[model samples]
Target chain A: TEEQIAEFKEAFSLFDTITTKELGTVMRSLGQNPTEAELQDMITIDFPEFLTMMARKMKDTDSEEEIREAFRVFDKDGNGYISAAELRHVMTNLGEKLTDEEVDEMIREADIDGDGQVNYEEFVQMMTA
Target chain B: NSFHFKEAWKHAIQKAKHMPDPWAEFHLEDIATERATRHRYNAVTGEWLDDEVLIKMASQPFGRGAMRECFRTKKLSNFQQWKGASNYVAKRYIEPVDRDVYFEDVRLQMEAKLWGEEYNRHKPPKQVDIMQMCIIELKDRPGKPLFHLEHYIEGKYIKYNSNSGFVRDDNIRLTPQAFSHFTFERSGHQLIVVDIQGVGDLYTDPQIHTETGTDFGDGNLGVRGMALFFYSHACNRICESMGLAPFDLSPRERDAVNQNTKLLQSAKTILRGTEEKCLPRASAVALEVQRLNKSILGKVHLAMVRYHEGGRFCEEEWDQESAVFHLEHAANLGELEAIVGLGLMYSQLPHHILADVSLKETEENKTKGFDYLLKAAEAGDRQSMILVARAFDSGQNLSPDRCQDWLEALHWYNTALEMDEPRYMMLAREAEMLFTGGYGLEKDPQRSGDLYTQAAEAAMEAMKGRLANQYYQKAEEAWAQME
Candidate 1:
């Protein structure tokens, strides 16, 4: 468990200082703010719990910009639509050279409105799902 | 010109298709069209890649700029992992939307290569440093010029401000602070300009450009003006007083708060114009409170609840970033509503935000994301728990074989029911089915019937309460006349 906590700290180290302060805020809400001495004590003793709290808070949230950027990569021709050829090219680029049949299958699965190409909404859903 | 370009492009693709491998062999997983399939085959070795190796090479881009993005791969060896190889950064060139954009990016890559090599030749002072860049080519996409990679010295981004305007972690520290550009500490304190997209004189020296025979088109102004605000004398003094150096270190949270407080105040003043124009007021306050106190409850009270209660509100326009900020902070603090808020946000996104670890929308991350609900449920957050249970019950999260664990769903539903003031209507529907021995339940009709009765009674009470409030005069008169 300590190992897990250590890994979590490493994985989410960027949030260590901020999340530490946030935990202090939550503890303060329960009653009173800890003195510096108490804070140190809690950091040493209650750290695993703090880490668990951080784990509980963790959620997978991404930005629309990120989604759009990925889409831009897949839509290699800069066309608004992700054509079957474009999808195949990207797959090959990622080193997974798919057959024509496989590419068609991918399109059929992702084309929610039954258009030939994968629209922005469908492309987003395909990856996000 | 067009014919020549087309022929070149065709030849390039053909060459790429048959380029010889010059490095260690590797394979890529054949991405499945549907779920329940994941495997990789080595093109060179003619062997399937082991799961461990594939996972070890589990790489994803963490950050992106206009021309390039950086990726991090999992460390396989114990020593490397121990030595913090997990933070290893590898920069890769991304093909832009169009051929012209791609060409511009290629030129920029060349410029970066030239800049790094020229810097190494002279070795500028610590006062003005440049990141060392090594150009590498991928074996699989050989001969594809756009597929070439650039490896820059790896370090964390020191202070991740929105989109831009922050230095990388471990870069060199320069003082009076104004004299820094993406400053990092590689061996010693080093100032590096890794981003060559913009026009700038590397190292703030016109002489270096003359010596290196290099000239960025825009002028040497990338690290000038308001971008260098944090490196001002006042800012430097503030950092020093707080037991920090001006460069190579992230700014104090207090500094960010101070800056945001000023912005929030300005936003409030702007909102003083009109009710309709003041949509951002709630969000502004929410951001301030979250930044200051890390309080999502504070946010909900100020921003969401008041708006919902017919207070001064505008649903059509609000700061989406402000809400996201609060939600993330709250989620990290293990707030249930924020956890659920994020779950719902993930379910419905055009999309989402959290900078820590580049929370990618991969299946593994999504599954982990949904597990946030289970954690919230354990903390007695009922709504999320219910959703989690329902998802399991109906096999909504993943493939049926892997995720459709009815027993687990039952456990969550039972947990929700154990909570005080459990949801009545949904519970009643579930209870009715369970009482009829449907939905994989044993014939425990008595218990199921009892739960149904309890939920119905609660719903009936709620309905009566609403009616009584709505027809107060009629109810009061009827009571008086009957009495």
Candidate 2:
């Protein structure tokens, strides 16, 4: 619930105007995407109330085991922990490029135990928390 | 040479066509024909501009402000000769035979342009030029109201001045204010151009204020209007160089009183005794007092009542500025009571006379105040005659002394000295001599001090604006022997 709210609010910050009628692209990248026009069609709702409605509407499709395996695809050498090097290697190749320094900061964020590497348990916390 | 000039004129008139430069940015709104008659006013030339022109307007208005909506024209037919901005706006105040209102609006605009022509051609750089307003009398039709057409000035619509002379912005260029100041000077101080607004140098729908209370319509705020204008209008470098007439910073509640009000409405009560359900309402004092003062006499009459009435308004807190205004108007209209009241106010302290911000008119206001008293005295007002003694007497208010014009004093002192008012006249004489010793009377400092106090108390009986209160304290510790 907290993760969905964080994602929705982050997407809203990208736009200069808040218009309800248009299906704006910022609304598309939302964590709890609305499939129908019926979800109180967007008009400046800044609350957990409508957010909870959209989050409930999203089917819980990604199994926790499934999500771990997807991370496993990025984990070359089948290491239990991923270093900042591999994370930097994967992110710079995405639509919005993340720089090496950003990847360094992310490594520090995900590795919450004070160790310099991210374990799978910490990686899930990084994604969810 | 004459033939050559005529041929050149012929070539230019033939060359006139829809030049593709100014108007293409304006999108096509709508198209139609409207009936029209154009009148032009000019002074340098012998004849006037009375001609014909076509008008096209969008059904939707482009701008809306007080009493009018602005609809920018669609276009002029290609065959016609239209000038200035690509398209012009039709000012629609067009309601009934609301002809008088809008027509006067056009008339004043053209007249203002006529006045400014020489000033514009004078080639003063960075000075703004007013956009010309062309008038049209549309044939009686359903959509047609009285329309004033002027070039659609396409830029930030800036307001430099309102009917009152307060400046709106610091970024306001000096020329417009200079122009208003110029109008006041050029009109021989009779009128000033107000409502100066529009884009860049181009302006539209200007208002003119007269010394007479008569407006071409309601927008004309007369005497007090000019008082406000002249009072605030500080001369900048341009105004200084223009050799414009200087205005008095003095609180002339007299000039501030539109001297013209009582002249317009009279027959029943006497010469001296002297709106709308819409958005703006009547913020000009007419609406608030409409049930009472509006029914009775002029605003000057209201001023008199307010000044005198310790009733309802409560003592000591009555509006002095408003009192000065109304009393000035009544004084101008030859009301004896108003004249005396105005005189008393003018003779008072500056803060009591006008605005508290301090325009130092101490000597000048005292002078005008005396003039008012003298006029009322001349008009056979005995009460004013006593006050008029301030004229010939030596001054005590400002410097505690002036010319002891005792010879002139004897005439007015004798004039104000009626049969019954016996002791105070002698008291005034004893105080006059006590301070400086005059009229062949030997000086007695202690006798004069007590004698001045007696005179001061007698004046307190009348209890006027600043004059009476001044004399009361003037003799107490202010005497030479008070120490």
Give the C-alpha interface root-mean-square deviation per candidate.
18.0, 38.2
Residue-wise C-alpha lDDT for candidate 2, range B1-483, written one tens digit per residue: 212122322222233322243455554433555657665444335345766656665667878766778877743532233333146677776345455666566567766665554443333322334455655666656654557676554356778788765665445466676677677655644567877776544556677777675755776776455544554455554555555534432244234322322422321211111000011112122332442331112332433434334223233564445455555544554566666666666666332223332223576777776777678778877766655554456453322233545545555666665434554655667566566666444456676677667777776665542544555555654365645
Q: Give the TM-scores of the predictions, in the order they appear.
A: 0.25, 0.43
- Rate residue B213 of model 1 by lDDT: 19
10 residues in a row with least lDDT, candidate 2 chain B: B271-280
- Candidate with the greatest TM-score versus the true structure: 2
Judging by lDDT against the true structure, name the best candidate. 2
lDDT string for model 2 (A1-129, tens) is 677677766666565444453234555655334445643544354444445645654533444644454454333222355545444433432222554445556656666786555778876665443
| Tens digit of per-residue lDDT, candidate 1, span A38-110 | 5555452245666665554342223454456556554542324665545555455445645545655666677
TM-score of chain A of 2: 0.47
Candidate 1 second chain TM = 0.29
Give the distance in Å from residue B416's predicted Cα in candidate 1 to where it truly belongs.
Answer: 3.6
